[PDB]
Design a protein around this ligand. Structure first.
Ligand SMILES: Nc1ncnc2c1ncn2[C@@H]1O[C@H](COP(=O)(O)OP(=O)(O)OP(=O)(O)O)[C@@H](O)[C@H]1O
Ligand SMILES: [Mg+2]
Ligand SMILES: [Mg+2]
Lengths: 985, 147
């Protein structure tokens, strides 16, 4: 009953059972400020049964620093009452309620309890009850640039999956009598010590096929040990092993017990003495609030800092903490006690929402137990931060002014950013910019570009969109929503519908790119990332890259003249199977899915394109006869789809589907077995169908079988769509039509002038003339995974399962087929929130103009295991050119539009280098090995005219520069790299 | 990318491949037209085979797309010119030059690999009736690889 049309991407991360158990759990949230609303939003998007809010405190103006569901018209109203109405719209399957008063016994109604903005005494009172009653308790807190998370799921928590990775599976070569299992050639099992595996389809040792898990003793990257298999057999040949994951028992401690002896989680290893300081500091904050009627220390106040430090000393003495208190860091915590940042709120809300999902689904490894985080490296240093600058001004930015001050607020308000993409990360980034007040000044501006449209599956993690917005452009909807959140952004946001690429340089040109301050990428492909990186490198603009994959995420910052660019690092490429594996000898379901996709394209897309091109281009036949690789194939396709096999009803489409079933699942297998029989041997004497080659078997068409009927239905429906006929789904017509079918005889064939050209002409003349068919077009089938009524995934699944039945491969369901064929990337809302928080914590470093490379932090995290890590960016490599220091990445030559000879002479004289190769884009303008005549013809030409002549394309009127790549040699003949050239037109 | 491609092109220019001749198409550095001479100790003797090479944008981190143009009767080469070469699909690493690829293709033409074929009928003919395979290969290398 799970709506896979909405949770399509989330089910690939969690699963069906996890979400089924998640949709029966109640979550209570105490506190409805920025952190609380972030947690509630992520939980509502996740899909829990219901969410209950409790926050009777009236709204204040500073609460708008991170609460995006509050407006300035709500001042004086309880926060929960004005937040429930806006939260109830995020997801229609998750009701949201509000409780005016909270009693202890009431806590029994919920599965998880999240506590924010609550004193320590109330937290102890709540936890002393939620512990003994087996209720998950999560407590979060955010003070300025500091954050704390605490998790307590009970003393007998059961965690089924502790790392989130798919079970390890593999194919076996041989198993010895001593349990030594060996993988296939150049295949790594990836198992670790202490794992349990189950063997299936093992030949020679049937006892291993029962499914009883056995211990794993890894002996090497290719072989491991399972123990004693003496009784079952002597040696096992081939087989498939699959890892078995056993549940783990995790025992938590209550808040009262863990205050004295906490168990920390370290988000970074460079500062491991801080969590002990934060443990005392947060308790001192609670004590100070209790001793001052709930008033936190005033921003940048020395008297309150001294009192807070006295409380810290008292607490450290009381708890027998033998740690020397760091006065500077503790007083820093005191100064930023009244801070409320949207980046920290987003980061902690994503983390806490993930913890809630772990508590409800009993999946992934949770935090155990304290998690203290700080981003103190983001505190500005180029502006004045004092008590006078940080005092509140009675505006919605008080929570941020209390940390950064008014001068940094003025710096933020005049930003001119450029956001590429409007996906989930784009929506989160826009929300963070709206809350921070980015580009609300006279000289501020925001530009957002995206060419995609809103779909149903995007509403699960892109909270700025609504079901009424399905089918509209992402950029316009996002800009309107964020203008609603912050009314000061009215007229400061421009939304484009342009794809960022080589074709958009007329809009995102020099004039557009010279006014920016930074560029933020929210893309999902590498080509666009590389293009934007090159543009930023050329224009010298800071870049913020961020990526997510399921529960994993990473953020990178590129700073001009300081760090390396995005393209300097290489990622693992996609794996493409060999053509001979897909064509004839598959052994995994992915091979059959790829073959089914190719079959779909070759049956319903390419022949239709050929027929349409023949009826449109007046001279298609002559061009194809000398240009296409297989003109005979084109002619046969045209003839078959025009005259020979043109359907006149849906019954003929069913007959065609049956014929294609025979062609692709009964006859080609017979031919393959005729060429290589099952008893054939290789040239070395080994059996042919051994190892990665599996013997196929032809399929006989049985109408009662489900897969055969599904393939027939899908193929007939797609053919009718190609010819625009009326498809049907009632089994009666299929069973009636296919009953009277006589399969044409087929026997494998051994084989054994311009006559063929004459036959090709024979086919050519038999085709109807183009004039006889005017206005007649065949509709091609364009692959679309997200729609379930087009019979695309159904056909791919049916064909893949039938080919798996040919080769005795285990068929997969439609879910896995859609995952594999569509290249669907798993995505989560919590990961998006975390990456947005990290990117917005780096943005304040970029705004402040920090110069040192140690002050920036590239971030990586994995929420399935609770892992966070931050590392300094890599510096840009340097080089020696003509006895001078040159940056490899961020340096260039600026030259006028001089002739080629003048450029060569300039490089000969100034740099003392002889130019040997000069190219612009993908064309070779000049090479040292070219014949003298060509050079003498090209030398006296200007660079622009040379480029126009060689590329055979006039330069656009908006073009203002040329980027040239030059390879030159030194005087001695040694090759020396040089930075690119920037010719000014 | 471009610099590595030009280094390979200069290496080809400085040292002639004798049995091969590769070069850019027109003036495009990401589209080459190479020529392979049929080995003397092979049925394809006295033949000229043209190959089209498409360098990827991520070269050398991705394999170039090498496709035959002249029709050839070989177990590992189909009608579309695709080549069953391990170093071009998933074994590719940024350490192999185009001259190495051409030499590997010449070696493949020297002796086919019918144990893991791409055209099962040609491999079956090769394994069973060697003389007929030789006759067909000579007929094809004279009809298509000459003139
Ligand atoms: N070259 C590009 N120029 C501009 N926007 C781009 C470009 N490439 C991708 N995008 C946009 O980047 C955003 C990526 O977000 P996301 O991947 O979450 O969405 P999606 O691809 O539509 O969804 P899904 O992958 O879940 O089916 C999309 O809006 C996509 O339109
Ligand atoms: Mg989309
Ligand atoms: Mg995407």
């Amino acid at each position: 009953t799970i709506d896979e049309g909405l949770y399509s991407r989330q089910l690939y991360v969690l699963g069906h059972e996890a979400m089924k158990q998640m949709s029966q759990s109640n979550v209570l949230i105490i506190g409805c400020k920025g952190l609380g609303v972030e947690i509630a939003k992520n939980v509502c998007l996740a899909g829990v049964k219901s969410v209950t809010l409790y926050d009777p405190q009236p709204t204040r103006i500073e609460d708008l620093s991170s609460q995006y569901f509050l407006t300035e018209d709500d001042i004086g109203v309880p926060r929960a009452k004005v937040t429930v109405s806006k939260l109830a719209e995020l997801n229609q399957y998750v009701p949201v309620s509000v409780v005016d008063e909270l009693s202890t016994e009431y806590l029994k109604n919920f599965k998880c309890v999240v506590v924010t903005e609550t004193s320590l005494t109330k937290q102890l009172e709540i936890n002393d009850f939620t512990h003994k009653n087996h209720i998950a308790y999560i407590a979060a807190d955010s003070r300025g640039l500091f954050g704390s998370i605490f998790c307590d799921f009970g003393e007998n928590f059961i965690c089924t999956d502790t790392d989130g990775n798919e079970p390890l599976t593999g194919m076996i070569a041989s198993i010895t009598d001593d349990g030594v299992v060996t993988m296939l050639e150049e295949t790594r099992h990836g198992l670790e010590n202490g794992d349990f595996v189950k063997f299936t389809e093992v030949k020679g040792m049937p006892g291993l096929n029962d499914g009883t898990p056995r211990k794993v003793e890894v002996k090497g990257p290719y072989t491991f040990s399972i123990g004693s298999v003496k009784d079952l057999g002597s040696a096992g040949y081939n087989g498939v092993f699959t890892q078995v994951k056993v549940p783990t028992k995790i025992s938590f401690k209550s808040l009262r017990e863990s205050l004295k002896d906490p168990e920390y989680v370290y988000p970074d290893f460079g500062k491991m003495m801080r969590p002990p300081q934060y443990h005392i500091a947060f308790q001192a904050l609670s004590a100070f609030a209790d001793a001052h009627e709930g008033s936190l220390p005033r921003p940048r106040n020395d008297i309150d800092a001294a009192e807070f430090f006295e409380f810290c000393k008292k607490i450290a003495s009381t708890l027998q903490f033998d740690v020397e208190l760091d006065e500077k860091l503790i007083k820093e915590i005191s100064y930023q006690a009244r801070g409320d940042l949207v980046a920290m709120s987003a980061f902690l809300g994503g983390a806490v929402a993930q913890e809630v999902l772990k508590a409800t689904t009993s999946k992934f490894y949770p935090l155990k137990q304290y998690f203290y985080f700080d981003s103190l490296e983001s505190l500005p240093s180029s502006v004045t931060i004092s008590e006078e600058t940080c005092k509140p001004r009675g505006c919605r930015y008080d929570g941020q002014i209390a940390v950064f001050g008014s001068e940094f607020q003025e710096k933020i308000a005049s930003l001119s950013t450029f956001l590429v993409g409007a996906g989930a990360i784009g929506c989160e980034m826009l929300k963070n910019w709206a809350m921070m007040g980015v580009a609300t000044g006279e000289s501020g501006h925001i530009s957002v570009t995206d060419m995609d449209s809103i779909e149903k599956s995007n509403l699960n993690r892109q909270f700025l969109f609504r079901p009424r917005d399905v089918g509209k452009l992402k950029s316009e909807c996002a800009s309107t929503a964020v203008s609603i959140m912050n009314p000061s952004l009215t007229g400061k946001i421009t939304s484009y519908q342009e794809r960022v690429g080589p074709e958009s340089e007329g809009i995102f040109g020099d004039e557009f790119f010279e006014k920016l301050s930074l560029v933020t990428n929210a893309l999902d492909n590498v080509e666009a990332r590389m293009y934007v990186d090159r543009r930023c490198v050329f224009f010298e603009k800071p870049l913020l890259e961020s990526g997510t994959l399921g529960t994993k995420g990473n953020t990178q910052v590129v700073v001009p003249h300081l760090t390396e660019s995005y393209g300097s690092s290489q990622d693992p490429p996609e794996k493409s199977f060999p053509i001979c594996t897909l064509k004839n000898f598959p052994n995994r379901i992915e091979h059959t899915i790829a073959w089914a996709r190719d079959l779909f394209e070759g049956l319903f897309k390419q022949p239709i394109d050929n027929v349409n091109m023949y009826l449109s281009s007046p001279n298609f036949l002559e061009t194809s006869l000398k240009t296409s690789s297989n003109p005979r194939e084109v002619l046969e396709n045209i003839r078959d789809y025009l005259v020979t096999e043109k359907p006149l009803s849906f019954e003929e489409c069913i007959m065609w589907a049956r014929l294609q079933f025979d062609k692709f699942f009964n006859n080609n297998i017979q031919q393959l077995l005729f060429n290589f029989p099952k008893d054939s041997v290789t040239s070395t004497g080994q059996p042919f169908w051994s190892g990665p080659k599996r013997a196929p078997t032809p399929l006989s068409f049985d109408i009662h079988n489900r897969e055969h009927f599904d393939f027939i239905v899908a193929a007939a429906s797609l053919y009718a769509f190609n010819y625009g006929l009326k498809s049907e789904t009632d089994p009666a017509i299929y069973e009636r039509v296919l009953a009277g079918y006589n399969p044409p005889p087929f026997a494998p064939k051994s084989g054994i002038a311009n006559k063929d050209k004459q036959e090709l002409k024979s086919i050519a003349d038999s085709l109807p003339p183009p004039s006889s068919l005017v206005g007649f077009r065949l509709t091609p089938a364009e692959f679309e995974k997200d729609d379930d009524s087009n019979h695309h995934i159904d056909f791919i699944t049916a064909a893949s399962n039938l080919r798996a039945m040919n080769y005795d491969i285990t068929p997969a369901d439609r879910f896995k087929t859609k995952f594999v064929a569509g290249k669907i990337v798993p995505a989560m809302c919590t990961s998006t929130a975390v990456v947005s928080g990290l990117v917005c914590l780096e943005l304040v470093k970029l705004v402040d103009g920090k110069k040192k490379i140690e002050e920036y932090k590239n971030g990586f995290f994995n929420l399935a295991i609770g892992l966070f890590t931050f590392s300094d960016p890599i510096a840009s490599p340097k080089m020696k050119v003509n006895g001078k220091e040159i940056d490899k990445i961020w340096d260039r030559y600026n030259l006028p539009d001089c002739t080629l000879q003048e450029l060569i002479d300039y490089f000969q004289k100034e740099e003392g280098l002889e130019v040997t190769m000069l190219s612009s884009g993908v064309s070779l303008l000049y090479a040292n090995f070219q014949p003298p005549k060509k050079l003498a013809e090209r030398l006296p030409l200007k660079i622009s005219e040379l480029v126009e002549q060689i590329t055979k394309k006039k330069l656009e009127p908006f073009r203002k520069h040329l980027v040239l790549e030059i390879c030159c040699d030194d005087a001695n003949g040694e090759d020396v790299e040089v930075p690119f050239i920037c010719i000014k037109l | 990318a471009l610099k590595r491609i030009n280094r390979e092109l200069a290496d080809l220019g400085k040292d002639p491949p004798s049995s091969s001749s590769a070069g850019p198409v027109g003036d495009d550095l990401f589209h080459w037209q190479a020529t392979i001479m049929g080995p003397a100790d092979s049925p394809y003797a006295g033949g000229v085979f043209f190959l089209s090479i498409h360098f990827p944008t991520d070269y050398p981190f991705k394999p170039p797309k090498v496709n035959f143009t002249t029709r050839i009767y070989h177990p590992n080469i189909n009608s579309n010119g695709s080549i069953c070469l391990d170093i071009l699909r998933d074994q590719w690493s940024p350490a192999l030059t185009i001259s190495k690829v051409l030499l590997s293709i010449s070696s493949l033409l020297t002796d086919p690999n019918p144990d893991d074929p791409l055209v099962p009928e040609i491999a079956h003919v090769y394994k069973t009736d060697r003389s007929r395979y030789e006759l067909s290969a000579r007929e094809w290398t004279r009809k298509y690889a000459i003139g």
